[PDB]
UniProtKB/Swiss-Prot annotation:
Homotetramer and heterotetramer of potassium channel proteins. Interacts with KCNAB1 and KCNAB2. Interacts with DLG1, DLG2 and DLG4 via their PDZ domains. Interacts with SIGMAR1. Part of a complex containing KCNA1, KCNAB1 and LGI1. Detected in a complex with KCNA1. Interacts with KCNA2. Interacts (via cytoplasmic N-terminal domain) with KCNRG. It comes from Rattus norvegicus (Rat). This is Potassium voltage-gated channel subfamily A member 4. It is found in: Cell membrane; Cell projection, Axon. Voltage-gated potassium channel that mediates transmembrane potassium transport in excitable membranes. Forms tetrameric potassium-selective channels through which potassium ions pass in accordance with their electrochemical gradient. The channel alternates between opened and closed conformations in response to the voltage difference across the membrane.
Amino acid sequence: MEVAMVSAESSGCNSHMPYGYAAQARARERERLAHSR
């Protein structure tokens, strides 16, 4: 089971980052822990 961590810092212009960028940091960071290749 994972810890209950809720967060939503975005209600105007906080997620101004281009779509896909918020999914490249964790996608590349997950390789350091799930390094299977």
